[PDB]
Design a protein around this ligand. Structure first.
Ligand SMILES: Cc1cc2nc3c(=O)[nH]c(=O)nc-3n(C[C@H](O)[C@H](O)[C@H](O)COP(=O)(O)OP(=O)(O)OC[C@H]3O[C@@H](n4cnc5c(N)ncnc54)[C@H](O)[C@@H]3O)c2cc1C
Ligand SMILES: Cc1cc2nc3c(=O)[nH]c(=O)nc-3n(C[C@H](O)[C@H](O)[C@H](O)COP(=O)(O)OP(=O)(O)OC[C@H]3O[C@@H](n4cnc5c(N)ncnc54)[C@H](O)[C@@H]3O)c2cc1C
Ligand SMILES: CC1=CC(=O)c2ccccc2C1=O
Ligand SMILES: CC1=CC(=O)c2ccccc2C1=O
Lengths: 188, 196
């Protein structure tokens, strides 16, 4: 199928970069794969609207067309990013802000939202340094993107994979987490 | 006391802009107040680090020095923003990422984190279209910034003021909300002081 990897990290020799390689290398050659490196793209995450440039027409903003086109083309989205302050890094938050706009990703109905990206699925791979037991007692940590961003847009299902205590553990342990990510990627 | 309002909205004629105006106008004159319009500042919310520019050095990044010094100066921070996708607009999220860095806003306890912004308190003013009953149940909606950002950095107390069904309510009801903001603002006072 058509696969869009949206990758978020400033350092090309990061552990998250390593996670990107695992996915790319283990994705079947039957898939058609494009990677969107937000940092390398120099993506501008700051959403702007006014009376001059109306919110209503955010769906037709020229600079964002390439990214709208990438999302519409994809059948399965894979997000790779570290948890910064319980959440997506700013560049990735703004990818959503700017690209997932009304009349493109969803529309307003009588009561709530109507999703428009149906037929689409996603996989979220997050890294962070919070222990696994602590996780029921925390806000977001990938759950906002999954539960309150991708789902409302009709994208289903969404698998959320957290690699936890990621700095406290050993290289050895991180290699094992890399192996499982490769494994999971293989069985898609 | 020293009050830093961090304001986040791309539209100078937005409702959020009206909330800012209500806050600025109703703060006691005994306070020294500084407003940081992230959008007017053309704030770059994209945190950069790598081999060349180590994460270790972030608390010494040049462009962000203006914004570290504002935080240090403040006794009280008021955050004003619309909820976008359950949380802070990207530009404000990057404000946290780039400014509230290790060795400035916090550092590492033998076990967890040690906040470095003690002596400060905050007020978060949010707008959104979700019913208030849903607030205890939705992820974030200002709860991350209050509970998992400001608190760990040793900022306390933190007041969370949510203006709900903001676009669904009437224009009289929105004006009523503005009155509520103005009145809370008038009560931002040092202990045993009255509003000047
Ligand atoms: C602004 C900011 C905010 C943060 N807020 C949160 C908070 O809300 N929640 C909390 O849980 N965490 C928080 N953190 C920490 C963050 O989640 C981690 O730093 C991150 O998830 C690790 O991913 P990375 O690619 O950046 O790791 P890197 O720093 O690149 O590497 C991490 C570790 O893996 C190693 N490594 C790299 N490659 C390999 C390999 N091939 N094999 C084995 N090991 C390897 C490294 O050498 C290192 O020890 C925050 C960090 C920042 C900078
Ligand atoms: C990218 C994006 C993502 C979003 N995600 C979420 C979601 O996660 N959850 C959901 O609950 N919300 C969501 N929203 C909606 C958002 O929270 C609201 O649009 C916002 O909070 C309203 O504040 P505003 O300043 O932008 O409103 P504005 O559009 O600027 O104005 C709103 C209303 O108030 C009126 N008004 C202006 N001034 C006054 C005044 N002085 N007195 C009385 N009325 C006045 C206006 O004329 C108007 O009818 C999202 C919006 C965007 C753009
Ligand atoms: C809540 C939180 C905030 C951080 O800035 C942070 C930075 C580095 C490691 C862990 C953390 C963390 O758990
Ligand atoms: C989940 C969600 C996402 C939105 O983009 C949004 C936009 C405008 C009003 C409400 C909402 C909302 O409830």
């Amino acid at each position: 199928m058509k696969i869009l990897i949206v990758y978020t990290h400033p350092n090309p020799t990061s552990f998250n970069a390593e996670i990107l390689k695992q996915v790319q290398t283990n994705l079947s050659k039957e898939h058609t794969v494009s990677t969107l490196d937000l940092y390398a793209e120099h993506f501008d995450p700051v959403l702007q609207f006014n009376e001059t440039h109306k919110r209503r027409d955010l769906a037709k903003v020229a600079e964002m067309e390439k990214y709208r086109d990438l999302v519409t083309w994809a059948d399965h989205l894979i997000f790779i990013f570290p948890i910064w302050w319980s959440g997506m890094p700013a560049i990735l938050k703004g990818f959503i802000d700017r690209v997932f706009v009304a009349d493109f990703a969803y529309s307003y109905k009588k009561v709530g939202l109507e999703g428009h990206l149906q037929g689409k699925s996603a996989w979220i791979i997050t890294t962070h340094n919070t222990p696994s037991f602590a996780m029921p007692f925390v806000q977001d940590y990938g759950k906002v993107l999954k539960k309150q961003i991708l789902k409302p847009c009709a994208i289903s299902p969404v698998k959320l994979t957290e690699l936890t205590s990621i700095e406290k553990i050993s290289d050895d342990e991180r290699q094992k987490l890399l192996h499982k990510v490769a494994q999971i990627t293989r069985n898609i």
